DNA sequence: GGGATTACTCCCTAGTCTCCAGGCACGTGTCAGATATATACATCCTGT
DNA sequence: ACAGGATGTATATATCTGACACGTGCCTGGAGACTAGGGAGTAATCCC
């Protein structure tokens, strides 16, 4: 059951390493049924967790951010990463892993924003799962390109 | 305030007892409460009369039972006998 | 003359609902004048109602009572 | 006392105390009997759910899970009694019975 | 173009299923105070009143029209003439 | 206020003549055939006060109802930017090959006014750093064999379930994970007899029974 | 035969104080529906 | 008749509003126990 994807096998060594390094990450993905089977995934190899989609109501939304961020143990993230575009704010969280290449760098850049903020203490790093051969190294490669136009114009 | 009555909550349990998967709109809710209405008046009415046509002055399931007989056609005014008569005998025994 | 307010192609409409296929020339005017009739005497017994209740404003209930003792209950207004 | 509704006791859904109270109250006899109020009262909820069924009935026909006037109007003209009973009674906003004379159908 | 007929059994269709109003509202407000006003003097009208007397008036209206239409057909006739409905409100009892 | 406010409120605001019109993210105002863009036009405003996120995707017809729209003279210049459209499209032949130089003078006559910069480099020297790690992965046995079953998909249907973004999105998909195309739930061994069928669910509610109801269709009558 | 009337014992309902809860008046919430975004391909209509 | 650019479709998300729905304070009419006047039940009997 769910393991049976290199993403997975991947996320789940780096997951075991950053319990080891003791920092609560995030996720962010396009399509949340994926985070529905990765709360499963978690729930089963016991790690305590949020879940924080466009479908919890607003108060749900900002009340269970702030008991994120007032909790130094709730280990993992789960956000959409388009509706991760609000006025959140995620100091406490100090890495962050995108499961998902999708074509604006501004999303992914903007939630890494949130991510890194301006009260952010320390290093966050940002790991972007690439497959090889398919169709997400595309969009990595039309992403790249677009983001290399805009910052060269509004440079 | 001035509360009025209705029978709204009657008409909705009944609603809930033979389709509890339905709804129900305020322009029929009306119309149910005001059907209700008019065949209270009616049955009321005629055992009124009834009474009055045997010189008596009181009206007891009797006069109800005929009235329902005059006014509600075949097998219509069968079930409604049968169900009056349940319930008066149920509420006889259960005191 | 508000009795011409009621249009040729709402008394084709209403004959349309009473399921009519085609309607004569003559049918329209008979129509108002039916129709004049009809809401002369009801709402003459609507206004009795009313002024028997000292009222100046007539209410549906009026309407209602009206109707009913012309043999024409209505219901979902109240009664 | 440990009081309760004489509703509960007939069985029934409809308020028997309040029949009683509109038959003592609404100028129909001097006395009126202790059965009067709940066969009335049987009476009338069963005349409503007969007409609730067929009415739930037309309902689900059009695919609509809140029955409106046209669903009253299409159950009580199709039932004959029903109709019986209604016949002087006019439906708001409950329109007419689709029905086309043969006649009128094309040749 | 269709056949003449095809276009009137379309409507018939159409508006046997349809339940809300046929005449407009205004007009028949306009006419239900021109003939109000020579029983009382500066009426004043609830809209549940007017719109209770146009749905008796269209009921009636449609409710007459079948009638007719069967006095028309019993004549052979697919076309409604003024004498199928003063037969009609003959028979009924209303000339 | 607010978007689908104004665009519910229009024909009130119309009549409401005004000064200063702010729109504070203009990335919900990020393109043309725009009905909430369309209604932000028709508006008697002295002064539209343009912020979004930032300039995005370089399509740069969001360039255009960013320029025109904010201010006349450029007005109706995107279509000149049309011909600079041609440009846009040599703009993926220039992030192939940038040794161009057409309107990017032209630009910097132009952002000169028009738009105002305060960068990274003000505001991270307060932070401190954000590394990106690249990490790869691959396709399992199942994996793969559903990918190049979709390539057969792609083979079968340029010559079921076939959407063009079933194709690119199960494409992601199967990268992401292959159980959301769908699987089997926990299953069982074959079973012989006769059991008692449920009839329905809406009957017993809470307080049922289960009943033993096992028996073989193999009967031996006696 | 059976409807009218009469003599007469009596059960049944009006009447009344107490009182308590079901139901009215009016309050906060929940999906349904609409409208977006975005990514390609698919397709249709028109002109060339 | 074929090519090109418009509109259309598809899969997946998102925000934001509408017309429903449910939930609660609280009055007044129903229920309970009771007496006793009396309409009604019922056997008897004239006689249409």
């Given at each position: 059951?769910v393991?049976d994807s290199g993403k997975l096998?991947?996320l789940?060594?780096?997951?075991?390493?950053?319990?080891?390094?003791?920092?609560?990450?995030?996720l962010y993905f396009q399509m949340t049924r994926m985070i529905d089977l990765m709360?499963?995934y978690?729930?089963?190899?016991?790690?305590?967790?949020?879940?924080?989609?466009?479908?919890?109501?607003?108060?749900?939304?900002?009340?269970?951010?702030?008991?994120?961020?007032?909790?130094?143990?709730?280990?993992?993230?789960?956000?959409?990463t388009?509706?991760?575009?609000?006025?959140?704010?995620?100091?406490?969280?100090?890495?962050?892993?995108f499961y998902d290449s999708d074509?604006?760098?501004?999303?992914?850049?903007?939630?890494?924003?949130?991510?890194?903020?301006?009260?952010?203490?320390?290093?966050?790093?940002?790991?972007?799962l690439?497959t090889?051969?398919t169709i997400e190294?595309?969009?990595?490669?039309?992403?790249?390109?677009?983001?290399?136009?805009?910052?060269?114009?509004?440079? | 305030?001035?509360?009025?009555?209705?029978?709204?909550?009657?008409?909705?349990?009944?609603?809930?007892?033979?389709?509890?998967?339905?709804?129900?709109?305020?322009?029929?809710?009306?119309?149910?409460?005001?059907?209700?209405?008019?065949?209270?008046?009616?049955?009321?009415?005629?055992?009124?009369?009834?009474?009055?046509?045997?010189?008596?002055?009181?009206?007891?399931?009797?006069?109800?039972?005929?009235?329902?007989?005059?006014?509600?056609?075949?097998?219509?005014?069968?079930?409604?006998?049968?169900?009056?008569?349940?319930?008066?005998?149920?509420?006889?025994?259960?005191? | 003359?508000?009795?011409?307010?009621?249009?040729?192609?709402?008394?084709?409409?209403?004959?349309?609902?009473?399921?009519?296929?085609?309607?004569?020339?003559?049918?329209?005017?008979?129509?108002?004048?039916?129709?004049?009739?009809?809401?002369?005497?009801?709402?003459?017994?609507?206004?009795?109602?009313?002024?028997?209740?000292?009222?100046?404003?007539?209410?549906?209930?009026?309407?209602?009572?009206?109707?009913?003792?012309?043999?024409?209950?209505?219901?979902?207004?109240?009664? | 006392?440990?009081?309760?509704?004489?509703?509960?006791?007939?069985?029934?859904?409809?308020?028997?105390?309040?029949?009683?109270?509109?038959?003592?109250?609404?100028?129909?006899?001097?006395?009126?009997?202790?059965?009067?109020?709940?066969?009335?009262?049987?009476?009338?909820?069963?005349?409503?759910?007969?007409?609730?069924?067929?009415?739930?009935?037309?309902?689900?026909?059009?695919?609509?899970?809140?029955?409106?006037?046209?669903?009253?109007?299409?159950?009580?003209?199709?039932?004959?009694?029903?109709?019986?009973?209604?016949?002087?009674?006019?439906?708001?906003?409950?329109?007419?019975?689709?029905?086309?004379?043969?006649?009128?159908?094309?040749? | 173009?269709?056949?003449?007929?095809?276009?009137?059994?379309?409507?018939?269709?159409?508006?046997?299923?349809?339940?809300?109003?046929?005449?407009?509202?205004?007009?028949?407000?306009?006419?239900?105070?021109?003939?109000?006003?020579?029983?009382?003097?500066?009426?004043?009208?609830?809209?549940?009143?007017?719109?209770?007397?146009?749905?008796?008036?269209?009921?009636?209206?449609?409710?007459?029209?079948?009638?007719?239409?069967?006095?028309?057909?019993?004549?052979?006739?697919?076309?409604?003439?003024?004498?199928?409905?003063?037969?009609?409100?003959?028979?009924?009892?209303?000339? | 206020?607010?978007?689908?406010?104004?665009?519910?409120?229009?024909?009130?605001?119309?009549?409401?003549?005004?000064?200063?019109?702010?729109?504070?993210?203009?990335?919900?105002?990020?393109?043309?055939?725009?009905?909430?863009?369309?209604?932000?036009?028709?508006?008697?405003?002295?002064?539209?006060?343009?912020?979004?996120?930032?300039?995005?995707?370089?399509?740069?017809?969001?360039?255009?109802?960013?320029?025109?729209?904010?201010?006349?003279?450029?007005?109706?210049?995107?279509?000149?930017?049309?011909?600079?459209?041609?440009?846009?499209?040599?703009?993926?032949?220039?992030?192939?090959?940038?040794?161009?130089?057409?309107?990017?003078?032209?630009?910097?006559?132009?952002?000169?006014?028009?738009?105002?910069?305060?960068?990274?480099?003000?505001?991270?020297?307060?932070?401190?750093?954000?590394?990106?790690?690249?990490?790869?992965c691959?396709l399992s046995?199942?994996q793969?064999?559903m990918y190049?079953?979709?390539?057969?998909?792609?083979?079968?249907?340029?010559?079921?379930?076939?959407?063009?973004?079933?194709?690119?999105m199960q494409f992601r998909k199967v990268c992401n994970h292959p159980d959301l195309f769908?699987?089997?739930?926990?299953?069982?061994?074959?079973?012989?007899?006769?059991?008692?069928?449920?009839?329905?669910?809406?009957?017993?509610?809470?307080?049922?029974?289960?009943?033993?109801?096992?028996?073989?269709?193999?009967?031996?009558?006696?």
């Amino acid at each position: 059951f769910v393991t049976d994807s290199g993403k997975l096998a991947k996320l789940d060594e780096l997951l075991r390493e950053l319990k080891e390094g003791g920092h609560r990450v995030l996720l962010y993905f396009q399509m949340t049924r994926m985070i529905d089977l990765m709360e499963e995934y978690l729930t089963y190899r016991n790690y305590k967790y949020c879940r924080l989609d466009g479908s919890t109501k607003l108060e749900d939304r900002r009340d269970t951010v702030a008991d994120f961020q007032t909790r130094p143990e709730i280990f993992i993230f789960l956000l959409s990463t388009r509706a991760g575009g609000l006025g959140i704010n995620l100091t406490t969280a100090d890495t962050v892993i995108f499961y998902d290449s999708d074509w604006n760098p501004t999303i992914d850049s903007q939630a890494m924003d949130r991510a890194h903020r301006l009260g952010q203490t320390k290093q966050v790093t940002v790991y972007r799962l690439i497959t090889r051969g398919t169709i997400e190294e595309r969009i990595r490669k039309r992403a790249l390109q677009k983001e290399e136009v805009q910052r060269v114009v509004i440079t | 305030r001035s509360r009025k009555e209705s029978y709204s909550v009657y008409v909705y349990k009944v609603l809930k007892q033979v389709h509890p998967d339905t709804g129900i709109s305020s322009k029929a809710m009306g119309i149910m409460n005001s059907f209700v209405n008019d065949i209270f008046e009616r049955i009321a009415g005629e055992a009124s009369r009834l009474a009055h046509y045997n010189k008596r002055s009181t009206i007891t399931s009797r006069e109800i039972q005929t009235a329902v007989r005059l006014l509600l056609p075949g097998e219509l005014a069968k079930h409604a006998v049968s169900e009056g008569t349940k319930a008066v005998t149920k509420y006889t025994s259960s005191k | 003359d508000n009795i011409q307010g009621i249009t040729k192609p709402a008394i084709r409409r209403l004959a349309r609902r009473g399921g009519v296929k085609r309607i004569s020339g003559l049918i329209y005017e008979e129509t108002r004048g039916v129709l004049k009739v009809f809401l002369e005497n009801v709402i003459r017994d609507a206004v009795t109602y009313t002024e028997h209740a000292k009222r100046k404003t007539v209410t549906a209930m009026d309407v209602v009572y009206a109707l009913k003792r012309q043999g024409r209950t209505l219901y979902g207004f109240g009664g | 006392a440990k009081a309760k509704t004489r509703s509960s006791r007939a069985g029934l859904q409809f308020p028997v105390g309040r029949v009683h109270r509109l038959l003592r109250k609404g100028n129909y006899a001097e006395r009126v009997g202790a059965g009067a109020p709940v066969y009335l009262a049987a009476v009338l909820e069963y005349l409503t759910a007969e007409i609730l069924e067929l009415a739930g009935n037309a309902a689900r026909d059009n695919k609509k899970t809140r029955i409106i006037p046209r669903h009253l109007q299409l159950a009580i003209r199709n039932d004959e009694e029903l109709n019986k009973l209604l016949g002087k009674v006019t439906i708001a906003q409950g329109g007419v019975l689709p029905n086309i004379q043969a006649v009128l159908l094309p040749k | 173009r269709y056949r003449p007929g095809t276009v009137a059994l379309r409507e018939i269709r159409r508006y046997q299923k349809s339940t809300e109003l046929l005449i407009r509202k205004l007009p028949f407000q306009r006419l239900v105070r021109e003939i109000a006003q020579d029983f009382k003097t500066d009426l004043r009208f609830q809209s549940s009143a007017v719109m209770a007397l146009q749905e008796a008036s269209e009921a009636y209206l449609v409710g007459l029209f079948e009638d007719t239409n069967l006095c028309a057909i019993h004549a052979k006739r697919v076309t409604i003439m003024p004498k199928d409905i003063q037969l009609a409100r003959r028979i009924r009892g209303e000339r | 206020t607010s978007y689908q406010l104004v665009v519910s409120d229009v024909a009130y605001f119309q009549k409401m003549k005004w000064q200063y019109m702010i729109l504070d993210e203009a990335q919900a105002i990020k393109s043309s055939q725009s009905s909430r863009w369309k209604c932000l036009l028709g508006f008697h405003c002295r002064n539209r006060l343009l912020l979004t996120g930032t300039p995005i995707q370089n399509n740069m017809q969001e360039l255009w109802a960013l320029l025109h729209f904010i201010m006349p003279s450029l007005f109706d210049s995107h279509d000149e930017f049309s011909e600079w459209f041609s440009k846009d499209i040599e703009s993926h032949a220039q992030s192939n090959t940038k040794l161009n130089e057409d309107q990017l003078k032209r630009l910097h006559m132009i952002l000169k006014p028009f738009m105002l910069r305060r960068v990274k480099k003000h505001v991270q020297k307060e932070l401190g750093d954000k590394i990106e790690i690249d990490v790869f992965c691959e396709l399992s046995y199942r994996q793969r064999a559903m990918y190049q079953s979709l390539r057969n998909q792609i083979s079968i249907m340029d010559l079921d379930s076939a959407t063009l973004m079933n194709l690119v999105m199960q494409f992601r998909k199967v990268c992401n994970h292959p159980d959301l195309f769908e699987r089997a739930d926990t299953s069982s061994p074959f079973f012989c007899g006769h059991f008692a069928e449920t009839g329905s669910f809406l009957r017993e509610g809470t307080n049922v029974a289960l009943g033993y109801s096992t028996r073989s269709l193999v009967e031996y009558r006696l």
